Amino acid sequence: HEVAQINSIPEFLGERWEKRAQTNITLRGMSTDGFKVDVIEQHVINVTGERA
Amino acid sequence: EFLVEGSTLTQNVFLDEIHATDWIIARTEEEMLSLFLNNDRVPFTDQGMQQLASVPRAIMQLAA
Numbered sequence: 001h002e003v004a005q006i007n008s009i010p011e012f013l014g015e016r017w018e019k020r021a022q023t024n025i026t027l028r029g030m031s032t033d034g035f036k037v038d039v040i041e042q043h044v045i046n047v048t049g050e051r052a
Numbered sequence: 053e054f055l056v057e058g059s060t061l062t063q064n065v066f067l068d069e070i071h072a073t074d075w076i077i078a079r080t081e082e083e084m085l086s087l088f089l090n091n092d093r094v095p096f097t098d099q100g101m102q103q104l105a106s107v108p109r110a111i112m113q114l115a116a
Contacts, residue, residue: 038096043084043104047077052069 001028076115083107 004024010017059067084107087094094100 040094040096040100040104041088045080045084045108047073047080047108049069049073052065 001026072115076111080107080111083111 004026006021006023009020009022011020012018061067061070084104087104087107094103
């Protein structure tokens with residue numbers, strides 16, 4: 001999706017300024033999973049007219 | 053010259069009262085059939101239960 005700002009952070013490691021850089025990289029992607037679930041496959045309906 | 057007594061079947065059961073209820077039934081059945089065929093699946097929960105209830109709640113509105 002985006003690459004972010006790039007900083008420079010030299011650090012005194014092992015008797016020597018060690019050059020370094022760091023950034024943030026962000027991806028973007030859908031989700032996958034799966035769970036077992038139950039389903040309807042028939043119906044039933046009752047209709048009455050109260051007062052004929 | 054015209055029809056008389058309104059095509060009764062019992063003391064006070066007129067023919068149109070039967071015809072209208074039969075129409076309501078035969079309409080709800082068709083609409084229920086046209087609902088399993090459009091959507092893939094109807095889950096077995098309240099979410100799917102109200103989805104099936106949506107058909108009579110529209111047929112009654114269309115009948116009133």
